[PDB]
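FAQ
Q: What does a multi-component entry look like?
A: The components come first, one per line:
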Amino acid sequence: MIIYRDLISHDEMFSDIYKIREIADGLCLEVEGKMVSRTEGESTVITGVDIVMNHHLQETSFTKEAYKKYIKDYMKSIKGKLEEQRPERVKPFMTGAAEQIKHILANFKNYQFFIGENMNPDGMVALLDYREDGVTPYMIFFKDGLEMEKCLEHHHH
Amino acid sequence: MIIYRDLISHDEMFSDIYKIREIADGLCLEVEGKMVSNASAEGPEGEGTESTVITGVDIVMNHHLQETSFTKEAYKKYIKDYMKSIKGKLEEQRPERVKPFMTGAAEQIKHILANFKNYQFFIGENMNPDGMVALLDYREDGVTPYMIFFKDGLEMEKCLEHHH
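Then the predicted structure of the entire assembly, as tokens:
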């Protein structure tokens, strides 16, 4: 098991129980979800994306203007982290993110927006969209905004 | 995140992303799962519509649990040996638990056998014949899946969060 945590907010975002692939020349991780149904007490049936339910992701929303403002600031926060920790990623992050912002805005209506449980305005905003079948959910995260935590092997002395 | 692992086989069985409760005086854990699954219709002239039952359970898919099956005779033999293996581990590691484990498991075995046809049977990814067999059943609502594990047959392992 590997946990993927938001570098800024420290929220758990997802784990490797889902299919994960790199897209956008290594800038983003695309995490394929499943639609699932849980029940709450007579029972009520509640359907949604597994990734969102399992990791307590919170739906949020934005105007385009507010998203443009937010995403510019988010890039600057990640640039600063990369400068300290991984200076080799700075250039591909900044050019890659510049390209992606234009495309996210061009397709703004197609997305739903999710943040970590803490709902930190500085944290990552994951994007939810659906495959060509219109039914299989997938979520997009910025790889440079995530920290990987392996669940380590545990032994007795 | 906390991982629950089979004490014998070392397989990951589940994690604390599910609703979990203890039952039978702390002998077992019940882990609640989630169901995983053109408007044309033929009407009376055709056949009835297909069943809407949802047969998928997320716990199984997420932790690579493997369905297995048993005759009632083979399950009796297996579960008796499984208790002996657990008693052993408790003797080595938690001697206090032996007595309530053996009475509690004796009761549980009779309950399971009485309700044998109600279960599906799942083991960890390694498919070790000495490992735990988790039992899948459905709540009284008819539709919510849950899985039963022997708590004494599990090890809890935290995924330790990093210092940031």
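Q: Is there any commentary attached?
A: Sometimes. For this entry: The first helix of chain B runs from residue 58 to 62.
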